[PDB]
Amino acid sequence: ATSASSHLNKGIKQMYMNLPQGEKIQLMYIWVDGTGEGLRCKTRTLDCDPKCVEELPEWNFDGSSTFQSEGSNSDMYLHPVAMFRDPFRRDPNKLVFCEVFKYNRKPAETNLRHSCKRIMDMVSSQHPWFGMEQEYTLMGTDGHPFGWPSNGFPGPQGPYYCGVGADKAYGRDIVEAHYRACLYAGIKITGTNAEVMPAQWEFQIGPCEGIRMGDHLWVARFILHRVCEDFGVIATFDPKPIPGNWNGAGCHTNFSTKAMREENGLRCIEEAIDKLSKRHQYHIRAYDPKGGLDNARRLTGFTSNINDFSAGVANRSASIRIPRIVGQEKKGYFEDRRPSANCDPYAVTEAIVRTCLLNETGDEPFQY
Amino acid sequence: ATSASSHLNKGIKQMYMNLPQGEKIQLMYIWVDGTGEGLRCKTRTLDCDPKCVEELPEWNFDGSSTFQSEGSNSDMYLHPVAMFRDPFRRDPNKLVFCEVFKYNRKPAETNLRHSCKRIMDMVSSQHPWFGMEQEYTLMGTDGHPFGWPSNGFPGPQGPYYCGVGADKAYGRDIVEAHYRACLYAGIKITGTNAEVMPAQWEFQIGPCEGIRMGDHLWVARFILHRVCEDFGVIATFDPKPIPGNWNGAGCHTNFSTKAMREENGLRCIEEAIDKLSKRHQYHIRAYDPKGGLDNARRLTGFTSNINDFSAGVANRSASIRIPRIVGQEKKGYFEDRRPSANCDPYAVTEAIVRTCLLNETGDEPFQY
Amino acid sequence: ATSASSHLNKGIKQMYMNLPQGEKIQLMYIWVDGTGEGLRCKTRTLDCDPKCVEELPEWNFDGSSTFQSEGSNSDMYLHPVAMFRDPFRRDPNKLVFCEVFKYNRKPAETNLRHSCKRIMDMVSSQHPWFGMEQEYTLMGTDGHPFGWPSNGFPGPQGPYYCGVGADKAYGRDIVEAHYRACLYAGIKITGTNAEVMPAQWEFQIGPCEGIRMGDHLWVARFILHRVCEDFGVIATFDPKPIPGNWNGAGCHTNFSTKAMREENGLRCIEEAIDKLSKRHQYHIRAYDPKGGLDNARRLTGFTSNINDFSAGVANRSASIRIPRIVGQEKKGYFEDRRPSANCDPYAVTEAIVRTCLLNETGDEPFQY
Amino acid sequence: ATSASSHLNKGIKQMYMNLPQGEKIQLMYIWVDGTGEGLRCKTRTLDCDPKCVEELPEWNFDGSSTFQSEGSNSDMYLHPVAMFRDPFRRDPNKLVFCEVFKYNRKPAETNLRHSCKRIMDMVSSQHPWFGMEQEYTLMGTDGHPFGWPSNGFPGPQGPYYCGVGADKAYGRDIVEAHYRACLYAGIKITGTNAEVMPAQWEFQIGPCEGIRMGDHLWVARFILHRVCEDFGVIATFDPKPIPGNWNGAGCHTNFSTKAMREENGLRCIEEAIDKLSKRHQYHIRAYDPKGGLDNARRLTGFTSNINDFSAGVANRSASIRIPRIVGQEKKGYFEDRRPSANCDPYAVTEAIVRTCLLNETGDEPFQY
Amino acid sequence: ATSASSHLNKGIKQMYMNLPQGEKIQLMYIWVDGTGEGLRCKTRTLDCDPKCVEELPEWNFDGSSTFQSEGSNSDMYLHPVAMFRDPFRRDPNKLVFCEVFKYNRKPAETNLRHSCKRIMDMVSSQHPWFGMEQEYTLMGTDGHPFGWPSNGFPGPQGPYYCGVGADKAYGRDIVEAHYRACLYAGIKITGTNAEVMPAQWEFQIGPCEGIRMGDHLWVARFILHRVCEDFGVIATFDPKPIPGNWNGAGCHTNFSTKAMREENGLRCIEEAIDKLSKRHQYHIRAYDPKGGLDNARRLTGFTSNINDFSAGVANRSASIRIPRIVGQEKKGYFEDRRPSANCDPYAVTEAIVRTCLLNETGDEPFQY
Ligand SMILES: [Mn+2]
Ligand SMILES: [Mn+2]
Ligand SMILES: [Mn+2]
Ligand SMILES: [Mn+2]
Ligand SMILES: [Mn+2]
Ligand SMILES: [Mn+2]
Ligand SMILES: [Mn+2]
Ligand SMILES: [Mn+2]
Ligand SMILES: [Mn+2]
Ligand SMILES: [Mn+2]
């Protein structure tokens, strides 16, 4: 069951997009709404052919329509912070991820990018590298996963992981289109695979230094949403898209700095793991938009326990996993398997840096 | 009845694949899962534009999701061994067939390529050439062959063999696409034809010296699976896809060495045939993933008998067939008609070489 | 009602065929099965880029699957005799019409091309030119003509002959595609038209000297079959596809030699017509694969009578028709309207030459 | 695929038929058209409430519309000869099988009942008893058997004979309704079963003395036609409804007289069998409306050969079969397995009586 | 996916069955074909209104069409042995379960009722009571269980056992109709329930002394088949209708005699259980038509192991279960959980009596 807009003749759209647009450039403005998990987009025309993000002009939108402000002063300004080519409108047009701001220049409630960027500007001396493996479930318009039998379930799990075939991988066309669009847009995407759950996939955004990780992950999520809209399906980042004995959707996070990637860098990995063991409660609170409510359906064991912390080397069921190659070479990175699929990358990255590099302690972040 | 993902608009996918990806290269990693008949695929991005297979980096995957390992140490490393262009992502992207290894560098349970490669490295002085004619049945998502009437059977056998017409060949588009993809990828494919059973086809991988035969056959199987996934059907290698008076799916194997292709080389053919007559039980055990259980439904006579060995010149019903041209010219090769359609090419090729060139005897292989 | 394979997404097939195949060349081998009216095809890969037909290698196939041989020695060799470009695989790939031979080099039962070629090698001094107007009926997979109402008939005959419009010509796309494919392949096709019966068309293969007529007609029939398979319909050459007051499908034959096309050549036309009047029974026996059984449903008068011979100038209902322009100019050719639509062109052409140029008499052909 | 009239709401028809009609009585007049295998029906209202057939009035119809007469004098009179209750209009209304007569009181071309009744009036002293097992194929409106897969065939023969289950018996509702209607109408029906061919059934009309056999069989055929019309399918009496390896539809005939059912009556069975052996050609000519043309597709062996006569005890493949119980008890009847399913019962019964009781000889019947 | 005959308008069938048939009585003859698991039915008309089974006449049928005899003497006689009212044709018509016999009065290959009846005539002094709980799976015409999602599976097992609701019980209408038909026909049916597998039900035939158990169970199976045919689904008695983690279909058997139901009758239960422990191999061979081949897919543990025998009190996983109430009261019966769902009740009952009451020993039955 696909969307009604998907059944429109795409040949007409291809013919219309084949027109030479000319000097005019369409700038698609992207930002995060008040829910903290959704995205919003609207386009504008610019004729100067800009080169840098700082050249792009500020924009404003009605925040009362995005669950971001009341009716008194509902106007919210958009400050561009990321600059990417548009894969749905080819090279001349561009994708613009923006930072939401209130009417009085204050950061919005869901605008975690301001604090995240401040933290990484503080810690840039250590060069923190992040990589997050977003896992999403391809769902039809009917609320059930794509390709799943009507009013039923497919076979048991096990053949679907990284599977090839009509009965092993559902909606691979969406994944291929999203991969090509992310490569075209300049998103630092490293790879993709099919997860254990059928119609559930994964794409790994590559090492991005600091705020670039959150920027690239958010733009990749928007690109995936637009590709699924073109194909007529819905990509949901719910941690537990289907209750029962089905694999949950999570977003593991890899963390590494200059010392952790240097020779004999395992000691810093142990220090970071101990700090995360100390701040497990804060991290699990900050690893999803609902403060652990959504992640309680994925990290239920039977995925590490939500209420119990555990770490180890090459442990799939541990909250923090050290790659076996990292332990063998005594250097590399460590993977945080706690964050959910709908987690805000800015909050996750900020919490990881605060616990590791800033030695933060307590139950609340410290304002600097 | 095709897959639900097939009904997605392919024009959108074509438009997205028309984007210039640029310097980034997608490497699709392919390996054999724990079932020994299925295949798994997942992709990664590499920016160095590699030339040789040894340059490609090693990868790891969760073996517990592919019926290959337990939960203790479920990580399995991937060692690339074959290097091919990607027909589904054009020239810059590549297909990578990999060798599965355990966490402690030991070969996996289904990783027969290690022993096969060792054997052919031993016997490379004789230059063994192999060619296997894989026969597959095009099945819809409903478990019945493609193009077959709903809840029924088509006309009797005889018009469908190498037939041309709407009512004589089912799913020829898949066969043409697979042939073009195999030619593009560099797979040494020689030809194709429609088998006696409707919707059942065949493609013959050409003479490949040693381990290249298994590599090319496995990559061709993966390419066929991906093409059928694109078209929305399922290609099954079951030896007896439909019970009753319907032709079974098998994978005949041609074998030849330097002496067997030389002048007056028929004597070596007789020696090899006698050795296979001696080791019929071992060969029939090693000619399918289930140790003769699957092949018991195809080689039931009425196809040579599974429990009875027979060989001859230009004999269709014999286990080993000498081509009539080979007998006329007193040189050439001989065909082994016993292996099933789901047989692992590595095991078949290794058994043939062990019986012929290594003069192996007994009921178990000898470890060197 | 079209075939289930037709509903497959052809965009995927176009994308796969857009790949550059490279140096490898696919040779599609074509031959006539044991029924004498059907065709069989299977392809092979050749890397030498051949120029002439004699360079192409011989092939073999299982004759027991084509109603051509018993189980004792079921292998039948294929000897290429015609060389054509492949319209379904573009210029580098080629179509190969082959001559079927038994295991002991003897011509097959349905291999009339050997005797036909011998006869025309004998009579090449007179330069016999032949042209046959094959008429076929476009039928869906349901056994009823294409575009005909479900469980019914269209309007009465008369508007459909050479008609233009949605309600006047059924399946014109197949005819256009077949015409383009025949022109691309080098088939000497002269024209096409819609016959009186709806969904029944006709294409006229042009003057081809001797065995070339049979070769080109058979290759054109195969190309039509493949085009209909691509479009999902079935092209039947039955003489009476639909019983009742509907036009039958026939294949008229034009015959001319050097003297018949020369000045004052009408006398040779009268001599040939008298010889055919003498040998009407032999010709009507040899003008269809069933020895007049199939043609008894078309040549029933109400089309000349099957049991009565008649000839004249510009007579539609006569067995032999002299074109009015030929009579006016006292030179040209004459048309034989007796052969059926499923007639073997080799047998028809051989019988015509034997009666006209070889002055054959009796009820059986004379072996030379 | 059922008829369009079948999809009409039958609840409305039931409601309308629930009305009390009153004193008026509907008389459905039945007769055989010019084809000799079809039936025609039209009704009239009579208010006298008749008791005997001779009371019913004569009727007339346009014979030019039933392939029975030319346009000069196309009126044909109907003479009622059989009297039966109407199962489609309940007890007060009646079914009337009539005898067709020309304008000049001469019997029609297809009116074999006159000669048949004369013969049995001659031979009534011997009390000939006849029973014919009509076998019919339930076909949908699309020309393919009922319940058969679209554009295909069901499983092989063997499970369908007298089968019970959804996949073993097709259209059993029609058979049950026809059995109930025949029992209600007074037709001497003995039993029913499912034949080897799927959707092919059989009903055996019981021992009827003389002309009553033909009358009851024709009325039963009409009742079956009307029941199939109500259900929306077509009951065809073609001897070979589906070409190939499928069971044909035939109408075996049992014959017995007073001496043949008496003690030590086997000698008369041998005499009758010898007479039928003598007159096999006449019988096979007179056992179908087309003079053996239709039966040539059923009695092709592989059913006794059409051109070869054979008889025996408990022989299924013999033209004449003596039941094994009859041979054991030295009395009873013998079965004639030659007549086709579309045979006229009057002609079959008349030929059997002429050969057995009247000792007729030659190639043409003798007019008395 | 239901049968095409199910979509016929049942209002017409109801109207036709509403006719008063009168004095004529339809006798439906039922017997077991050569497969040993299927059933066959065909009807005849009798006008004497019989009271007892011995009054009914013998019948004959073509055994070559039921996989029961060769073509030499294919006639097989039917001897009625059970007498039941017909629920599909109301009170006047009757159901007749018959005993198949060869042409020479010898019992057929699948006619186990003769030996079973002889054994129970021998052992009638002890009054053996049997009750078998047949479990069947309601399957559509497509080969998948009724109500299951197309190309998929429903939720996991556990809510479906004896469930009530649209999503908990599939095809309850068939079960209710079958229960009513069995009660009407006089079948000693005790109860019904829905098994763990969805669309899989169970009906328990009550205590029937000796051969009556087999008779009633076979007639109940035929009634279930006819009811499913009316509703358009297929009732399969396969031991493992769906491979995987789904409950298998079995037919447990309760056994009790006069001593076992008397006071302090537990000792005889122990003796019988010990005898069955001794003869486990013979029983498991004789508990299905395929000699343990079918039951190997159901009794695989994970249902007691097929190769391991075990017995106990109130043990679900044991081959022989003593009911807990029986152990508490020291009297009653014991349940044999080994027989499969397609088991012949005659063979099961005969084996149980031979092991228990006749003290049979060895690997083959002893002919008396
Ligand atoms: Mn992963
Ligand atoms: Mn991972
Ligand atoms: Mn082959
Ligand atoms: Mn072969
Ligand atoms: Mn014309
Ligand atoms: Mn013409
Ligand atoms: Mn019969
Ligand atoms: Mn019979
Ligand atoms: Mn139970
Ligand atoms: Mn129970």
Curated annotation (Swiss-Prot), chains A, B, C, D, E:
Its EC number is 6.3.1.2, 2.3.1.225. It comes from Rattus norvegicus. Its cofactor is Mg(2+); Mn(2+). It is a lipid-anchor. Keywords: Acetylation, Angiogenesis, ATP-binding, Cell membrane, Cytoplasm, Endoplasmic reticulum, Ligase, Lipoprotein, Magnesium, Manganese, Membrane, Metal-binding, Microsome, Mitochondrion, Nucleotide-binding, Palmitate, Phosphoprotein, Transferase, Ubl conjugation. It comes from the Eukaryota. Glutamine synthetase that catalyzes the ATP-dependent conversion of glutamate and ammonia to glutamine. Its role depends on tissue localization: in the brain, it regulates the levels of toxic ammonia and converts neurotoxic glutamate to harmless glutamine, whereas in the liver, it is one of the enzymes responsible for the removal of ammonia. Decamer; composed of two pentamers. Interacts with PALMD. Interacts with RHOJ. Interacts with BEST2; this interaction tethers a fraction of GLUL to the membrane, causing a decrease of cytosolic glutamine synthase (GS) activity and inhibits the chloride channel activity of BEST2 by affecting the gating at the aperture in the absence of intracellular glutamate. Palmitoylated; undergoes autopalmitoylation. The modification Phosphotyrosine is found at residue 103. Transmembrane segments: none annotated. PANTHER family: GLUTAMINE SYNTHETASE (PTHR20852:SF45). Residues 23-105 form the GS beta-grasp domain. Belongs to the glutamine synthetase family. Residues 112-368 form the GS catalytic domain. One of its GO terms (biological process) is positive regulation of erythrocyte differentiation. This is Glutamine synthetase.
